[PDB]
PDB file of C-alpha atoms in Angstrom:
ATOM      1  CA  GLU L   4      21.608  -6.319   0.007  1.00 45.80           C
ATOM      2  CA  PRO L   5      19.494  -5.119  -2.968  1.00 49.32           C
ATOM      3  CA  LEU L   6      17.092  -7.721  -4.136  1.00 49.65           C
ATOM      4  CA  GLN L   7      17.113  -7.941  -7.922  1.00 49.71           C
ATOM      5  CA  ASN L   8      15.091  -9.761 -10.410  1.00 50.34           C
ATOM      6  CA  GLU L   9      16.100 -11.688 -13.565  1.00 50.12           C
ATOM      7  CA  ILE L  10      16.415  -8.308 -15.269  1.00 45.67           C
ATOM      8  CA  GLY L  11      18.559  -6.942 -12.453  1.00 44.82           C
ATOM      9  CA  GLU L  12      15.871  -4.544 -11.235  1.00 44.09           C
ATOM     10  CA  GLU L  13      15.257  -4.196  -7.561  1.00 43.39           C
ATOM     11  CA  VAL L  14      12.188  -6.380  -6.591  1.00 47.41           C
ATOM     12  CA  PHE L  15       9.051  -4.239  -6.008  1.00 47.22           C
ATOM     13  CA  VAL L  16       5.835  -6.205  -5.257  1.00 48.02           C
ATOM     14  CA  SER L  17       2.237  -4.974  -4.842  1.00 50.06           C
ATOM     15  CA  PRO L  18       1.742  -4.099  -1.197  1.00 50.20           C
ATOM     16  CA  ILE L  19      -2.126  -4.243  -1.491  1.00 50.35           C
ATOM     17  CA  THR L  20      -4.830  -6.112  -3.433  1.00 49.19           C
ATOM     18  CA  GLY L  21      -7.048  -3.843  -5.449  1.00 45.80           C
ATOM     19  CA  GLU L  22      -6.966  -1.658  -8.625  1.00 44.59           C
ATOM     20  CA  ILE L  23      -3.744   0.211  -9.722  1.00 40.75           C
ATOM     21  CA  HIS L  24      -3.914   3.787 -10.748  1.00 41.93           C
ATOM     22  CA  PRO L  25      -1.557   6.464 -11.829  1.00 41.21           C
ATOM     23  CA  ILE L  26      -0.750   8.996  -9.041  1.00 43.43           C
ATOM     24  CA  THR L  27      -2.837  11.624 -11.012  1.00 42.32           C
ATOM     25  CA  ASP L  28      -6.075   9.818 -10.094  1.00 41.21           C
ATOM     26  CA  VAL L  29      -5.707  10.360  -6.176  1.00 43.27           C
ATOM     27  CA  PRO L  30      -8.319  12.914  -5.283  1.00 44.67           C
ATOM     28  CA  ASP L  31      -6.122  15.006  -3.095  1.00 44.62           C
ATOM     29  CA  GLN L  32      -3.724  17.510  -4.742  1.00 45.72           C
ATOM     30  CA  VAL L  33      -0.906  16.967  -2.109  1.00 45.34           C
ATOM     31  CA  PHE L  34      -0.575  13.595  -3.711  1.00 48.75           C
ATOM     32  CA  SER L  35      -1.815  13.971  -7.333  1.00 50.91           C
ATOM     33  CA  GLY L  36       0.321  17.104  -7.635  1.00 47.64           C
ATOM     34  CA  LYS L  37       3.309  14.989  -6.603  1.00 46.40           C
ATOM     35  CA  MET L  38       4.205  17.294  -3.751  1.00 44.22           C
ATOM     36  CA  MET L  39       6.018  14.643  -1.762  1.00 44.94           C
ATOM     37  CA  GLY L  40       7.239  12.716  -4.680  1.00 46.12           C
ATOM     38  CA  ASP L  41       6.241  10.654  -7.729  1.00 47.44           C
ATOM     39  CA  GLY L  42       4.418   7.325  -7.274  1.00 45.91           C
ATOM     40  CA  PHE L  43       1.291   5.462  -7.998  1.00 45.00           C
ATOM     41  CA  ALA L  44      -1.908   4.547  -6.097  1.00 42.92           C
ATOM     42  CA  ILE L  45      -3.974   1.496  -5.380  1.00 41.74           C
ATOM     43  CA  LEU L  46      -7.757   1.480  -4.599  1.00 42.17           C
ATOM     44  CA  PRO L  47      -7.840  -1.354  -2.190  1.00 43.19           C
ATOM     45  CA  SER L  48     -10.238  -4.241  -2.185  1.00 42.41           C
ATOM     46  CA  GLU L  49      -8.711  -5.940   0.928  1.00 46.02           C
ATOM     47  CA  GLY L  50      -7.402  -4.160   3.881  1.00 49.27           C
ATOM     48  CA  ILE L  51      -4.123  -5.929   4.252  1.00 48.93           C
ATOM     49  CA  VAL L  52      -0.879  -4.035   3.505  1.00 46.20           C
ATOM     50  CA  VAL L  53       2.317  -6.028   2.949  1.00 47.09           C
ATOM     51  CA  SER L  54       5.930  -4.927   2.302  1.00 49.00           C
ATOM     52  CA  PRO L  55       6.565  -4.304  -1.358  1.00 48.04           C
ATOM     53  CA  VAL L  56      10.397  -4.659  -0.852  1.00 46.46           C
ATOM     54  CA  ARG L  57      13.238  -6.179   1.214  1.00 46.34           C
ATOM     55  CA  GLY L  58      14.211  -3.163   3.351  1.00 49.31           C
ATOM     56  CA  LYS L  59      13.662  -1.340   6.679  1.00 48.16           C
ATOM     57  CA  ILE L  60      10.825   0.392   8.396  1.00 48.12           C
ATOM     58  CA  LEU L  61      11.579   3.992   9.010  1.00 46.98           C
ATOM     59  CA  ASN L  62       8.451   5.414  10.485  1.00 46.34           C
ATOM     60  CA  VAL L  63       5.068   4.148  11.593  1.00 41.33           C
ATOM     61  CA  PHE L  64       2.591   7.109  11.956  1.00 43.31           C
ATOM     62  CA  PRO L  65       0.874   7.207  15.450  1.00 41.33           C
ATOM     63  CA  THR L  66      -2.531   6.634  13.834  1.00 42.77           C
ATOM     64  CA  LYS L  67      -1.036   3.552  12.104  1.00 41.39           C
ATOM     65  CA  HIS L  68      -2.464   4.518   8.689  1.00 38.29           C
ATOM     66  CA  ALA L  69       0.810   5.332   6.916  1.00 38.88           C
ATOM     67  CA  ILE L  70       4.235   3.660   6.996  1.00 43.16           C
ATOM     68  CA  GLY L  71       7.599   4.847   5.654  1.00 43.43           C
ATOM     69  CA  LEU L  72      10.104   2.329   4.400  1.00 43.03           C
ATOM     70  CA  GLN L  73      13.488   2.214   2.782  1.00 42.22           C
ATOM     71  CA  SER L  74      14.466  -0.604   0.419  1.00 43.46           C
ATOM     72  CA  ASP L  75      17.891  -2.243   0.587  1.00 43.69           C
ATOM     73  CA  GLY L  76      18.529  -0.499  -2.658  1.00 43.81           C
ATOM     74  CA  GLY L  77      17.963   2.976  -1.041  1.00 46.04           C
ATOM     75  CA  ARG L  78      14.562   4.142  -2.229  1.00 45.68           C
ATOM     76  CA  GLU L  79      12.377   5.722   0.353  1.00 43.74           C
ATOM     77  CA  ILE L  80       8.698   4.896   0.074  1.00 44.87           C
ATOM     78  CA  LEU L  81       5.701   6.157   1.940  1.00 44.00           C
ATOM     79  CA  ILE L  82       2.479   4.178   1.877  1.00 43.37           C
ATOM     80  CA  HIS L  83      -0.416   6.290   3.160  1.00 44.72           C
ATOM     81  CA  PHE L  84      -3.590   4.404   3.465  1.00 44.01           C
ATOM     82  CA  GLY L  85      -6.673   6.227   2.324  1.00 43.69           C
ATOM     83  CA  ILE L  86      -7.364   9.962   1.896  1.00 45.99           C
ATOM     84  CA  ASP L  87      -7.795  12.169   5.041  1.00 45.83           C
ATOM     85  CA  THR L  88      -7.466   9.230   7.410  1.00 46.93           C
ATOM     86  CA  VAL L  89      -5.664  10.911  10.247  1.00 45.39           C
ATOM     87  CA  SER L  90      -9.119  12.081  11.258  1.00 45.33           C
ATOM     88  CA  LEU L  91      -9.902   8.553  12.313  1.00 42.46           C
ATOM     89  CA  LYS L  92      -7.311   8.678  15.049  1.00 42.42           C
ATOM     90  CA  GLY L  93      -6.201   5.137  14.483  1.00 44.21           C
ATOM     91  CA  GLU L  94      -9.509   3.529  14.589  1.00 44.45           C
ATOM     92  CA  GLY L  95      -9.724   0.622  12.268  1.00 45.80           C
ATOM     93  CA  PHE L  96      -5.906   0.301  11.880  1.00 45.39           C
ATOM     94  CA  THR L  97      -3.642  -2.363  13.228  1.00 45.46           C
ATOM     95  CA  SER L  98       0.183  -2.287  12.948  1.00 45.07           C
ATOM     96  CA  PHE L  99       2.466  -5.403  12.815  1.00 47.03           C
ATOM     97  CA  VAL L 100       5.799  -3.744  12.547  1.00 47.95           C
ATOM     98  CA  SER L 101       7.884  -1.265  14.471  1.00 48.39           C
ATOM     99  CA  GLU L 102      10.408   1.344  13.381  1.00 48.80           C
ATOM    100  CA  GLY L 103      13.781  -0.113  12.578  1.00 48.32           C
ATOM    101  CA  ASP L 104      12.229  -3.569  11.718  1.00 50.19           C
ATOM    102  CA  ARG L 105      13.784  -5.289   8.756  1.00 50.47           C
ATOM    103  CA  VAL L 106      11.081  -6.575   6.297  1.00 48.92           C
ATOM    104  CA  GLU L 107      10.948  -9.055   3.396  1.00 50.67           C
ATOM    105  CA  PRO L 108       8.587  -8.805   0.456  1.00 50.36           C
ATOM    106  CA  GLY L 109       5.027  -9.849   1.358  1.00 48.43           C
ATOM    107  CA  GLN L 110       5.566  -9.411   5.034  1.00 47.98           C
ATOM    108  CA  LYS L 111       2.398  -7.935   6.604  1.00 49.47           C
ATOM    109  CA  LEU L 112       2.706  -4.371   7.705  1.00 49.08           C
ATOM    110  CA  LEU L 113      -0.829  -3.296   8.519  1.00 49.69           C
ATOM    111  CA  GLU L 114      -4.365  -4.409   8.591  1.00 50.92           C
ATOM    112  CA  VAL L 115      -7.341  -2.086   7.965  1.00 49.15           C
ATOM    113  CA  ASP L 116     -10.958  -2.709   8.794  1.00 45.19           C
ATOM    114  CA  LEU L 117     -12.433  -1.402   5.607  1.00 46.27           C
ATOM    115  CA  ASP L 118     -16.004  -1.326   6.783  1.00 47.54           C
ATOM    116  CA  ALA L 119     -15.044   0.863   9.739  1.00 52.16           C
ATOM    117  CA  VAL L 120     -12.931   3.114   7.532  1.00 53.12           C
ATOM    118  CA  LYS L 121     -14.895   3.338   4.300  1.00 55.30           C
ATOM    119  CA  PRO L 122     -17.777   5.258   5.639  1.00 54.09           C
ATOM    120  CA  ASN L 123     -15.562   7.932   7.165  1.00 53.27           C
ATOM    121  CA  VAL L 124     -13.093   9.024   4.532  1.00 53.11           C
ATOM    122  CA  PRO L 125     -13.647  10.532   1.177  1.00 51.69           C
ATOM    123  CA  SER L 126     -11.701   7.813  -0.686  1.00 49.73           C
ATOM    124  CA  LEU L 127      -9.885   4.665   0.109  1.00 49.85           C
ATOM    125  CA  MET L 128      -7.333   5.401  -2.626  1.00 48.86           C
ATOM    126  CA  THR L 129      -3.957   4.702  -1.247  1.00 49.61           C
ATOM    127  CA  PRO L 130      -0.853   6.476  -2.594  1.00 50.13           C
ATOM    128  CA  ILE L 131       2.532   4.760  -2.759  1.00 48.71           C
ATOM    129  CA  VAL L 132       5.057   7.639  -3.001  1.00 44.83           C
ATOM    130  CA  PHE L 133       8.745   7.433  -3.743  1.00 44.63           C
ATOM    131  CA  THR L 134      10.163  10.218  -1.666  1.00 44.46           C
ATOM    132  CA  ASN L 135      13.883  10.354  -2.691  1.00 44.42           C
ATOM    133  CA  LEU L 136      13.915   9.822  -6.443  1.00 43.77           C
ATOM    134  CA  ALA L 137      16.809  11.181  -8.468  1.00 45.24           C
ATOM    135  CA  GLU L 138      16.732  14.140 -10.635  1.00 43.27           C
ATOM    136  CA  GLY L 139      14.895  12.962 -13.752  1.00 43.77           C
ATOM    137  CA  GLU L 140      13.516   9.551 -12.396  1.00 45.80           C
ATOM    138  CA  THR L 141       9.824   9.030 -13.034  1.00 46.28           C
ATOM    139  CA  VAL L 142       7.423   6.296 -11.951  1.00 43.04           C
ATOM    140  CA  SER L 143       5.544   4.317 -14.571  1.00 45.80           C
ATOM    141  CA  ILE L 144       2.747   1.783 -13.945  1.00 43.20           C
ATOM    142  CA  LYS L 145       3.256  -1.564 -15.794  1.00 42.64           C
ATOM    143  CA  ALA L 146       0.323  -3.529 -14.442  1.00 41.96           C
ATOM    144  CA  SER L 147      -3.246  -2.606 -15.422  1.00 40.99           C
ATOM    145  CA  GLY L 148      -6.643  -3.281 -13.712  1.00 43.14           C
ATOM    146  CA  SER L 149      -6.674  -5.383 -10.580  1.00 42.92           C
ATOM    147  CA  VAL L 150      -3.334  -6.305  -8.831  1.00 41.97           C
ATOM    148  CA  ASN L 151      -2.909  -8.590  -5.971  1.00 43.96           C
ATOM    149  CA  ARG L 152      -0.675  -8.304  -2.955  1.00 43.66           C
ATOM    150  CA  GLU L 153       2.757  -9.678  -3.818  1.00 45.64           C
ATOM    151  CA  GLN L 154       2.461  -9.440  -7.525  1.00 44.36           C
ATOM    152  CA  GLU L 155       5.765  -8.361  -9.101  1.00 43.53           C
ATOM    153  CA  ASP L 156       6.671  -6.157 -11.865  1.00 39.74           C
ATOM    154  CA  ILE L 157       3.817  -3.667 -11.387  1.00 40.54           C
ATOM    155  CA  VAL L 158       5.696  -0.406 -11.911  1.00 42.26           C
ATOM    156  CA  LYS L 159       8.923   0.935 -13.300  1.00 44.27           C
ATOM    157  CA  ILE L 160      11.235   3.770 -12.284  1.00 44.90           C
ATOM    158  CA  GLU L 161      12.614   5.164 -15.567  1.00 46.01           C
TER     159      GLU L 161
ATOM    160  CA  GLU D   4      12.113  42.413  -6.977  1.00 44.35           C
ATOM    161  CA  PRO D   5      12.775  41.007  -3.464  1.00 43.92           C
ATOM    162  CA  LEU D   6      11.139  43.037  -0.797  1.00 46.16           C
ATOM    163  CA  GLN D   7      13.528  43.598   2.094  1.00 42.35           C
ATOM    164  CA  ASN D   8      13.206  45.087   5.452  1.00 45.24           C
ATOM    165  CA  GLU D   9      15.491  47.480   7.385  1.00 46.79           C
ATOM    166  CA  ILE D  10      17.640  44.449   8.175  1.00 49.04           C
ATOM    167  CA  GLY D  11      17.728  43.400   4.531  1.00 50.19           C
ATOM    168  CA  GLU D  12      15.579  40.316   5.108  1.00 50.24           C
ATOM    169  CA  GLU D  13      12.863  39.496   2.669  1.00 50.35           C
ATOM    170  CA  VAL D  14       9.473  40.765   4.095  1.00 50.11           C
ATOM    171  CA  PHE D  15       7.342  37.878   5.468  1.00 51.41           C
ATOM    172  CA  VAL D  16       4.039  38.920   7.134  1.00 52.28           C
ATOM    173  CA  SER D  17       1.457  36.814   9.013  1.00 52.83           C
ATOM    174  CA  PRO D  18      -1.025  35.517   6.472  1.00 51.11           C
ATOM    175  CA  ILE D  19      -3.686  34.736   9.189  1.00 50.51           C
ATOM    176  CA  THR D  20      -4.866  36.054  12.572  1.00 54.40           C
ATOM    177  CA  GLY D  21      -4.632  33.505  15.325  1.00 55.81           C
ATOM    178  CA  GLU D  22      -2.002  31.703  17.494  1.00 56.30           C
ATOM    179  CA  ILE D  23       1.503  30.788  16.095  1.00 56.60           C
ATOM    180  CA  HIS D  24       2.913  27.387  16.661  1.00 57.05           C
ATOM    181  CA  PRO D  25       5.975  25.478  15.732  1.00 60.08           C
ATOM    182  CA  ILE D  26       5.395  22.978  12.859  1.00 58.61           C
ATOM    183  CA  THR D  27       5.784  20.110  15.461  1.00 56.62           C
ATOM    184  CA  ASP D  28       2.397  20.978  17.000  1.00 57.45           C
ATOM    185  CA  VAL D  29       0.286  20.188  13.729  1.00 60.59           C
ATOM    186  CA  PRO D  30      -1.561  17.003  14.491  1.00 58.33           C
ATOM    187  CA  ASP D  31      -0.853  15.322  11.224  1.00 62.02           C
ATOM    188  CA  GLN D  32       2.559  13.642  10.716  1.00 59.63           C
ATOM    189  CA  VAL D  33       2.789  14.616   6.952  1.00 61.67           C
ATOM    190  CA  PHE D  34       3.232  18.097   8.267  1.00 66.61           C
ATOM    191  CA  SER D  35       4.743  17.760  11.788  1.00 65.17           C
ATOM    192  CA  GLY D  36       7.257  15.286  10.364  1.00 65.96           C
ATOM    193  CA  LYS D  37       8.252  17.965   7.856  1.00 69.71           C
ATOM    194  CA  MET D  38       7.640  15.701   4.897  1.00 70.32           C
ATOM    195  CA  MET D  39       7.035  18.523   2.461  1.00 70.20           C
ATOM    196  CA  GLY D  40       9.322  20.947   4.077  1.00 70.78           C
ATOM    197  CA  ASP D  41      10.046  22.970   7.227  1.00 67.67           C
ATOM    198  CA  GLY D  42       7.613  25.695   8.352  1.00 65.36           C
ATOM    199  CA  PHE D  43       5.346  26.795  11.077  1.00 67.83           C
ATOM    200  CA  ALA D  44       1.576  26.722  11.762  1.00 66.40           C
ATOM    201  CA  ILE D  45      -1.133  29.097  12.817  1.00 65.60           C
ATOM    202  CA  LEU D  46      -4.389  28.115  14.648  1.00 63.77           C
ATOM    203  CA  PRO D  47      -6.687  30.612  13.122  1.00 67.02           C
ATOM    204  CA  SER D  48      -9.142  32.812  14.918  1.00 66.39           C
ATOM    205  CA  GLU D  49     -10.443  34.543  11.720  1.00 66.56           C
ATOM    206  CA  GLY D  50     -10.947  32.877   8.469  1.00 64.66           C
ATOM    207  CA  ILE D  51      -9.233  35.353   6.245  1.00 59.58           C
ATOM    208  CA  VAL D  52      -5.929  34.386   4.563  1.00 59.68           C
ATOM    209  CA  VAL D  53      -3.736  37.143   3.119  1.00 57.16           C
ATOM    210  CA  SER D  54      -0.424  37.023   1.196  1.00 53.76           C
ATOM    211  CA  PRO D  55       2.537  36.910   3.523  1.00 51.19           C
ATOM    212  CA  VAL D  56       4.913  38.144   0.713  1.00 49.05           C
ATOM    213  CA  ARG D  57       5.284  40.119  -2.545  1.00 51.32           C
ATOM    214  CA  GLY D  58       5.360  37.252  -5.071  1.00 52.29           C
ATOM    215  CA  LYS D  59       3.274  35.056  -7.421  1.00 54.58           C
ATOM    216  CA  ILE D  60       0.533  32.534  -7.069  1.00 53.52           C
ATOM    217  CA  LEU D  61       1.569  29.187  -8.347  1.00 53.41           C
ATOM    218  CA  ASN D  62      -1.303  26.915  -7.595  1.00 54.37           C
ATOM    219  CA  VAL D  63      -4.785  27.209  -6.156  1.00 57.34           C
ATOM    220  CA  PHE D  64      -6.094  23.711  -5.114  1.00 61.21           C
ATOM    221  CA  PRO D  65      -9.559  22.878  -6.686  1.00 62.54           C
ATOM    222  CA  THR D  66     -11.141  22.745  -3.220  1.00 61.03           C
ATOM    223  CA  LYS D  67      -9.699  26.243  -2.579  1.00 61.49           C
ATOM    224  CA  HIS D  68      -8.312  25.271   0.851  1.00 63.02           C
ATOM    225  CA  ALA D  69      -4.595  25.448   0.030  1.00 64.87           C
ATOM    226  CA  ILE D  70      -2.564  27.893  -2.075  1.00 65.62           C
ATOM    227  CA  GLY D  71       1.034  27.692  -3.316  1.00 63.01           C
ATOM    228  CA  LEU D  72       3.044  30.850  -3.737  1.00 64.92           C
ATOM    229  CA  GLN D  73       6.515  31.937  -4.662  1.00 65.64           C
ATOM    230  CA  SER D  74       8.052  35.110  -3.232  1.00 65.90           C
ATOM    231  CA  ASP D  75      10.034  37.515  -5.407  1.00 66.05           C
ATOM    232  CA  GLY D  76      13.005  36.283  -3.501  1.00 69.36           C
ATOM    233  CA  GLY D  77      12.408  32.643  -4.686  1.00 72.07           C
ATOM    234  CA  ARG D  78      10.980  30.794  -1.706  1.00 73.17           C
ATOM    235  CA  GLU D  79       8.122  28.498  -2.418  1.00 71.72           C
ATOM    236  CA  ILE D  80       5.422  28.421   0.229  1.00 72.51           C
ATOM    237  CA  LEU D  81       2.354  26.301   0.613  1.00 74.65           C
ATOM    238  CA  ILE D  82      -0.434  27.428   2.906  1.00 75.79           C
ATOM    239  CA  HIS D  83      -2.845  24.564   3.592  1.00 76.39           C
ATOM    240  CA  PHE D  84      -5.811  25.580   5.564  1.00 76.16           C
ATOM    241  CA  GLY D  85      -6.876  23.169   8.246  1.00 75.85           C
ATOM    242  CA  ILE D  86      -6.191  19.433   8.675  1.00 75.98           C
ATOM    243  CA  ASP D  87      -7.980  16.912   6.354  1.00 76.57           C
ATOM    244  CA  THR D  88      -9.978  19.615   4.604  1.00 77.96           C
ATOM    245  CA  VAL D  89     -10.075  18.175   1.135  1.00 77.49           C
ATOM    246  CA  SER D  90     -12.950  16.108   2.471  1.00 80.15           C
ATOM    247  CA  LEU D  91     -15.059  19.226   2.490  1.00 79.60           C
ATOM    248  CA  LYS D  92     -14.897  19.492  -1.267  1.00 77.32           C
ATOM    249  CA  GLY D  93     -14.594  23.233  -1.226  1.00 78.51           C
ATOM    250  CA  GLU D  94     -17.461  23.966   0.959  1.00 78.26           C
ATOM    251  CA  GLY D  95     -16.842  26.931   3.131  1.00 77.69           C
ATOM    252  CA  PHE D  96     -13.894  28.210   1.009  1.00 80.15           C
ATOM    253  CA  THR D  97     -13.763  31.214  -1.228  1.00 84.47           C
ATOM    254  CA  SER D  98     -10.782  32.101  -3.474  1.00 84.52           C
ATOM    255  CA  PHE D  99      -9.798  35.681  -4.553  1.00 85.38           C
ATOM    256  CA  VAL D 100      -6.796  34.919  -6.635  1.00 88.53           C
ATOM    257  CA  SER D 101      -5.906  32.862  -9.664  1.00 87.41           C
ATOM    258  CA  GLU D 102      -2.732  31.060 -10.687  1.00 88.50           C
ATOM    259  CA  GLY D 103      -0.120  33.364 -12.105  1.00 88.55           C
ATOM    260  CA  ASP D 104      -1.544  36.399 -10.141  1.00 86.66           C
ATOM    261  CA  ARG D 105       1.064  38.709  -8.724  1.00 85.50           C
ATOM    262  CA  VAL D 106       0.360  39.512  -5.001  1.00 82.82           C
ATOM    263  CA  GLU D 107       1.516  42.137  -2.479  1.00 82.33           C
ATOM    264  CA  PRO D 108       1.743  41.585   1.253  1.00 83.74           C
ATOM    265  CA  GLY D 109      -1.680  41.640   2.942  1.00 85.06           C
ATOM    266  CA  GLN D 110      -3.537  41.015  -0.245  1.00 83.46           C
ATOM    267  CA  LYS D 111      -6.487  38.672   0.454  1.00 82.05           C
ATOM    268  CA  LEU D 112      -6.096  35.207  -0.905  1.00 82.44           C
ATOM    269  CA  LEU D 113      -8.927  33.230   0.642  1.00 82.52           C
ATOM    270  CA  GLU D 114     -11.817  33.433   2.955  1.00 79.59           C
ATOM    271  CA  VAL D 115     -13.012  30.518   5.129  1.00 76.78           C
ATOM    272  CA  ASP D 116     -16.328  30.159   6.872  1.00 74.03           C
ATOM    273  CA  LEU D 117     -15.039  28.826  10.128  1.00 75.12           C
ATOM    274  CA  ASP D 118     -18.371  27.772  11.513  1.00 73.65           C
ATOM    275  CA  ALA D 119     -19.032  25.625   8.446  1.00 76.44           C
ATOM    276  CA  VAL D 120     -15.529  24.170   8.569  1.00 76.76           C
ATOM    277  CA  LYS D 121     -14.832  23.767  12.271  1.00 76.30           C
ATOM    278  CA  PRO D 122     -17.316  21.087  12.924  1.00 79.35           C
ATOM    279  CA  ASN D 123     -16.029  18.909  10.098  1.00 80.17           C
ATOM    280  CA  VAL D 124     -12.278  18.697  10.423  1.00 82.44           C
ATOM    281  CA  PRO D 125     -10.161  17.411  13.199  1.00 82.67           C
ATOM    282  CA  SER D 126      -8.217  20.681  13.618  1.00 82.03           C
ATOM    283  CA  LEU D 127      -8.176  24.092  12.134  1.00 85.74           C
ATOM    284  CA  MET D 128      -4.386  24.255  12.515  1.00 86.48           C
ATOM    285  CA  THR D 129      -2.985  25.630   9.364  1.00 85.81           C
ATOM    286  CA  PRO D 130       0.571  24.800   8.240  1.00 86.07           C
ATOM    287  CA  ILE D 131       2.719  27.300   6.352  1.00 85.47           C
ATOM    288  CA  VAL D 132       5.416  25.161   4.657  1.00 88.61           C
ATOM    289  CA  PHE D 133       8.524  26.329   2.877  1.00 88.07           C
ATOM    290  CA  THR D 134       8.906  23.800   0.132  1.00 87.79           C
ATOM    291  CA  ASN D 135      12.302  24.672  -1.483  1.00 88.33           C
ATOM    292  CA  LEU D 136      14.601  25.535   1.404  1.00 91.60           C
ATOM    293  CA  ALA D 137      18.337  25.114   0.969  1.00 98.00           C
ATOM    294  CA  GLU D 138      20.394  22.436   2.401  1.00 96.99           C
ATOM    295  CA  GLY D 139      20.766  23.407   6.061  1.00 98.12           C
ATOM    296  CA  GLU D 140      18.059  26.239   6.221  1.00 97.27           C
ATOM    297  CA  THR D 141      15.655  25.896   9.122  1.00 93.19           C
ATOM    298  CA  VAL D 142      12.545  27.849  10.084  1.00 91.52           C
ATOM    299  CA  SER D 143      12.373  29.537  13.464  1.00 91.85           C
ATOM    300  CA  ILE D 144       9.317  31.243  15.010  1.00 92.61           C
ATOM    301  CA  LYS D 145      10.053  34.766  16.397  1.00 90.96           C
ATOM    302  CA  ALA D 146       6.572  35.822  17.425  1.00 90.22           C
ATOM    303  CA  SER D 147       4.829  34.146  20.376  1.00 88.23           C
ATOM    304  CA  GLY D 148       1.097  33.812  21.312  1.00 88.04           C
ATOM    305  CA  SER D 149      -1.448  35.549  19.135  1.00 85.28           C
ATOM    306  CA  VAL D 150      -0.365  37.097  15.744  1.00 85.72           C
ATOM    307  CA  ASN D 151      -2.448  39.148  13.500  1.00 83.78           C
ATOM    308  CA  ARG D 152      -2.686  39.144   9.744  1.00 84.98           C
ATOM    309  CA  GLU D 153       0.028  41.389   8.326  1.00 81.52           C
ATOM    310  CA  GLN D 154       2.248  41.423  11.320  1.00 81.47           C
ATOM    311  CA  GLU D 155       5.925  41.334  10.305  1.00 81.38           C
ATOM    312  CA  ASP D 156       8.895  39.678  11.631  1.00 80.79           C
ATOM    313  CA  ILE D 157       7.121  36.533  12.870  1.00 79.34           C
ATOM    314  CA  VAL D 158       9.623  33.893  11.768  1.00 78.18           C
ATOM    315  CA  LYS D 159      13.189  33.514  10.637  1.00 79.76           C
ATOM    316  CA  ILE D 160      14.913  31.251   8.123  1.00 80.15           C
ATOM    317  CA  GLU D 161      18.363  30.541   9.615  1.00 83.70           C
TER     318      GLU D 161
END
């Protein structure tokens, strides 16, 4: 099951193209305060979201702006596109996966019409939250600046 | 420390006047899906928020729309006023407490100008989330219909 790289780490690829930020930069304390878990964020420049891991879809929000996944290695991840986006009721969001789907890295999960979304939210910053980390595990960003969808080795869980 | 009633339960009073709802009725899956914890919600009819317990303030969000508290008995509670309210940047919210303050039931924590807020959010539904419940503890609503600030015995942790 678990997909591991040449260093025997589980593969974790950038799910979105844009700029990588520490989780402390999300301008919403539910996320910067790590209330659901540690993680990182990406300010997107394209509105396509792809799977960062080989794993399974656990939950697709009704508004299609956030997706929950679990990697073959057991980490649960939530990707929530944008800040305060449930207000949009789904408008501008398309889903390409269903709950229980099995996904491979780079497989498309969602597509966002940024021009329809941008004007209506306070920030397009998108948190990537690890929701079941072990006691003592922290997230660290390895990449810096712009990242592209499918780029590996962008963060580390230490 | 712990404040207990005639049944030896820790005192938990309604922090807001309005209508009590199960946590499944909040129209935002981060909350209805219990991602930060189990709880309940109130649809406010007045914009005053008071302490539901004797305890301590842990965190006052910068926008002043959500407050984190811990009861003398050790339960951590987050009260987040409204849905997608960080977008308002604080406008319409007044705070009357600081982090580390000690609070008594009914003590005022916040005041919200509903008319300034209502038009700008998708719902005024306010979740009350218990963020450190034990393995197996669930929240149950006892009250039904309208509740007023300071009314006891509105929910049960079983």
